[PDB]
Amino acid sequence: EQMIQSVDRTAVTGASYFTSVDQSSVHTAEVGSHQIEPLKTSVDKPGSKKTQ
Amino acid sequence: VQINPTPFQQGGLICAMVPGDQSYGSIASLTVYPHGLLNCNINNVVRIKVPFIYTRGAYHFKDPQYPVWELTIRVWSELNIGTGTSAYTSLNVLARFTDLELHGLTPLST
Amino acid sequence: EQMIQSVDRTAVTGASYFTSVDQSSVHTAEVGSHQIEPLKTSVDKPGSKKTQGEKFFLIHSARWLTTHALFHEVAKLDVVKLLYNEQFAVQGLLRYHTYARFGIEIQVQINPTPFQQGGLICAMVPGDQSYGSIASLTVYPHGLLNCNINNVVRIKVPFIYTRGAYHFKDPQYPVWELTIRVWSELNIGTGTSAYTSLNVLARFTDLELHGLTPLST
Amino acid sequence: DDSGGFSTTVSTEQNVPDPQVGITTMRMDVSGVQAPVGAITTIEDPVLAKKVPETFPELKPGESRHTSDHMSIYKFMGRSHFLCTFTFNSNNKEYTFPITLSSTSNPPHGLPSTLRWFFNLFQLYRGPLDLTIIITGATDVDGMAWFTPVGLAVDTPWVEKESALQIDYKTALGAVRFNTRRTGNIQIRLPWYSYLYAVSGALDGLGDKTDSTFGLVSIQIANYNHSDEYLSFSCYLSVTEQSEFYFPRAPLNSNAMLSTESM
Amino acid sequence: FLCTFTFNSNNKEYTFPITLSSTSNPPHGLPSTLRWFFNLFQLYRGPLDLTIIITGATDVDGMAWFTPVGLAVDTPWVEKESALQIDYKTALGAVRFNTRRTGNIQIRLPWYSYLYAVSGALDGLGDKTDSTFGLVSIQIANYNHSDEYLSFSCYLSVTEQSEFYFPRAPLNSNAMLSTESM
Amino acid sequence: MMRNETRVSTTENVVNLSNYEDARAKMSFALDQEDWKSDPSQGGGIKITHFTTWTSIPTLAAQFPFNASDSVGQQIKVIPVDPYFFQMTNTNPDQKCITALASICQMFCFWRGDLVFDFQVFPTKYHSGRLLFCFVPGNELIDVTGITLKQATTAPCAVMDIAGVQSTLRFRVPWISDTPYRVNRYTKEAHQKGEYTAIGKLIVYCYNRLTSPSNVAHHVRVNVYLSAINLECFAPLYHAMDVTTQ
Amino acid sequence: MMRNETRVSTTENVVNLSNYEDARAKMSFALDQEDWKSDPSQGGGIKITH
Amino acid sequence: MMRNETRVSTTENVVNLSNYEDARAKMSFALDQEDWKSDPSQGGGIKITHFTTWTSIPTLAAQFPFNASDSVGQQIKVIPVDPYFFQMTNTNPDQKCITALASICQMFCFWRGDLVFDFQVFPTKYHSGRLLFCFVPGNELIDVTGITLKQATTAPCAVMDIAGVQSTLRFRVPWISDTPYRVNRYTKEAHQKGEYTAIGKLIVYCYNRLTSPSNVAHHVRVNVYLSAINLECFAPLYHAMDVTTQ
């Protein structure tokens, strides 16, 4: 007997200090990925706690 | 992007992350852009994640050229209901940066 | 912790070209199984595409006379179009498929009395005879008939067309136009029958049907 | 997620570029006598939506009769398509037209037909372009042409007038000279010389004025006594292998697809 | 040999179809050898190397494009002002040339058709859709008729990628026609 | 004794932009004839190179309503089966919303493959009904109004229960034709028997009437996306397909 | 120092259709200059050549 | 049977001087087509081949004075950050003294890299003071007069004690931009938001007022040289940059 895929109702997302609880959820869509400048547009250390 | 339609409501929306401007793109082809579809009978949330997409190597805050992203949210299927149900649903939008690369400390403000 | 069985909501069923999606489903009930006749009730091959579609059928039938001059066309037939007709079983297959590709086998026969003389030529010409030289009909898949010799001829061909299949309900141009002309005037002696009837048999070969349809025209 | 984010459900790729080939080939059946599970899905969910569609039993298509795949952008746009056309009226004059993706700028003062369409299928473009231009009419007319990069001096666009630029300056940016008698056509490559990372067609006013341009071309005639015939110029562009295309957009709606109707 | 035509006014165009049809009699149809050949068999498919000779005029800019069966294209066998967007024309793949610098063009015609193959011997209906390889259109420009006349002659040659299926009875002599000229 | 002779062949100084082999430049403006490497810096790695990219992204081609007033076997919507189809449109900004699938194929003379119709329902967990999707093999112009629902079950088709945890039924219309490819006749003045754009028409019937209480809409809307798989197009051309006003 | 010189021989831009070697096209309308395979599908394998 | 045919391609007898591949001669006047060896005889071995040669030689771009009368936090001089800058000039012989750095970059459309400002003080072992050099990231036109000295410490900057055994502070301005390269807009009629030549402006503030006795000047002059490292320019053009009158 073949089981047929059905979405996942409940789920929990967030980042840093922000959390979300969703009851009628679905999956997250993403496209492409992080790209690293083969030729940097700026040579200074990227902003960081220490930087600033 | 999230909302809260009561199961007695029906219809849906579409949320698209469009770079720069919608220009004259076919509304019906919004699905092409990184999108999320909302259907009452189904989901009440959608999540989209993208990288840096621009003509320049970075965005200038103090005085921008053109917006990096123009998030558009349109009615994908008219929101009808039965007599008595709430005739609306509020909606919110959450955003956050990812892989944040800052450059050039400055005293300006505008 | 014991899990207790609960039905399977969503599911998908169907057969051949019919699919169903059901949301508040349940399982299918069946009883017994297929039984094979220990004593067959009928000995003929059970109906099959070949049974009913790839067999022979009588298309057209005419007369050949002493009055018919040389090259007289005794018959011009859209073989395919002719088969497509309730009159023959193969219809049952065609009548419900939009297009189909295939080969053909033609058998033409007659019955001249040895006291008759002359002959005919039968050619399977694709599309139309156009302005081809009647005298060169032998080039097409043909069969020659000579009283003093044979009273039958058989030709077999594959699918030859500009399109990948023939459209029955509403054709473009006939696949095959079988032509039968007088190859040598049919003369006789005073008293002999001045004619001979003639028949034409046809059947499909390697019948490939496509796209079930409810139409009729 | 390296960004300090967390989730309980997954995140798959949505609308992935170059998913399948464009020519009928085998990269048995394609689906059948099994059970079409791909006949049902919850399109709202990105994962599920990628589930391969299948409704009825089909067989493998087979092999296409032609060599190359017409759906490969490189090969398709490899056919130099139409760009613009203009005509000189007086002698010792010049015309300067910009190469602008802008969906806004309507022809003739803008991208037309195919080129217009194509450059709005995606957000970012960069890389050289093989321009080729056909000369019509006149003869024994000496001419010159030069490519001017975005952000530099150049005679006023879409306008026939007497050049206001030092011969030195012109030639300096790299130029070419030719004569109608000996040729009647020129195929030269345009460089990816821009201070930007890439250019785009779909933009809004401001950026639509700086970041929507590859560069500009300028053609200047000479020795054209108008006692002669007329002098027409037609330009066509073809994408090169060193050209890149990033991020797919929703195609321009039909009402915005315009063409310079002529003959 | 295939066909030949002549321009009378400036900025005009001619569009001729490549039709095997035994029906269509020249000049508005296949002539001499080509006519004969394409009726020796039932089905044809595969590219064809067209080559065209220019006669007369000079310093005349011209353009030509191959249009596949079943698509928009200026009315056949007729000299008239084109009714097609320059865009459209060029889009189907085209070529430009000038009488002064050349006087002849040899380019290959593609097997671009929704059919499996085409045929000459047919009957009316099919004889209107399945009897055509495709069409060629030539448009002139800068031809002040104060000048000489402008003639065009087209010839076809079969390629190795061309195929020929099923032999027919050759056309009877009475149907073999030729565009008698010089 | 310098002796390299060559004959000047035909087509002298002729120009051809049909393909790249002849369209590519013969010299360059670039200094030292240099070239360029790749660079996805601000392109997020999403490098495009094939139109498939679009043709496989379900885009919205049409919206139709399913009313309770619709009785069993009533034809609800009829659609021709060819990539070029789309009927969506917005008043102001005034525009004709072509689909991705369409916007691509519109630039080709020929096409073949499995078109994919995705039906998305927008009901409420309180409605109930079934719709029968039916593909009638043929051409873009076949009178089909004379077809009982029953009659339609002869052609390949599928039924869908709306009330559910799922929302979309996918209709993968198998390439069925008498020809290897169909043509973009949508450019021609009139129509000619045999020069077809579609392989048949799709029909939406009311399988089981739409039931429901009274505190929910008296109907249920449906979105119809369109995309293709095993798609093949060839013979470039230019044409901005208009809207197919059903 | 680019130095590839050739002399323009007789019969400049002359056309000859006597044989294929000179009759064959010198360029093509086909996209990407592609070609075509064989296909006897509807030709019943009866391929003619002589 | 001589049979070498070639087709005459497009661009017949066309001339292109964009690069050497097409600019180089196709024949020579030299007898027997000979060539020449090298010879540094009277060239002292100093053979040149790259413009870097100049762009890395600090040249004088500007002179500014530091007066005692200048109070703490007073802006003393403001400079745009782009190779094209220079303000030096002599009355007679009448001339506009461009810098090496400048004279090179002026012939390019684009540039990127670390510009280097060298500050040379001309004091006496009896003065005492500090100056704060501040780079404000941006474009060549940003109102900056509204910036407290304090406010400036937010941007990258450096302070220098004048009184000393050393004489020059080097300011290596890191390439900071929203674009991979900046453009030579100094050729255009007007200015357009986004088409910038510099990556920001440099500012000279008075960190600690200039102290001293009374038998020494009431001020101290300063030379500002300019050169670049990791410099890159491309897209040749011609333009004689004028003076940037601050």
Ligand SMILES: [Cl-]
């Ligand atoms: Cl002359």
Ligand SMILES: [Cl-]
């Ligand atoms: Cl003027």
Ligand SMILES: [Cl-]
């Ligand atoms: Cl000449």
Ligand SMILES: [Cl-]
């Ligand atoms: Cl007219």
